[PDB]
């Protein structure tokens, strides 16, 4: 059973990566199950909707009263040392909000870190149907 724990903003980095203070330490988090267009992609550099995704995450996270992180049931860090979590700003999941606005796709999913996969696939179907952003 998943639970939310509190965290504090340090810096938004990209559409899908944020640095937070978590249990008293700075830590980089990568949003579970979504891929945003990148502004510092290792190879392509700046992709279309990169700046828009990155601004959406930044505004949502900077204007929140309360930020919480929710780990999934599997590994809690990736190979780069980033925390793998669902991030909530005032109780709304940022991972879902990005997919809903057509600013992210649902990622390739690695069981058992797939608890909210179906929920996110439903939001992406809606964004596609509305032809938002990525999908226009």
What does this structure look like?
- It is classed as hydrolase.
- The entry lists the keywords DNA hydrolase, RNA hydrolase, endonuclease, hydrolase.
- The assembly is monomeric.
- The entry is titled "Crystal Structure of Staphylococcal nuclease mutant I72V/V99L".
- The protein has 136 residues and is α+β, with helices and mostly antiparallel strands.
- It has one domain (1-136): OB fold (Dihydrolipoamide Acetyltransferase, E2P) (Beta Barrel).
- It is 24% helix and 29% strand.
- The chain has 3 helices and 8 strands, in the order ββββαβββαβα.
- The strands form 2 sheets. The chain has a 5-stranded mixed β-barrel. It has a two-stranded antiparallel ribbon with strand order 4-8.
- A hairpin with a 4-residue loop joins β1 (5-12) and β2 (17-22).
- The N and C termini lie far apart (37 Å).
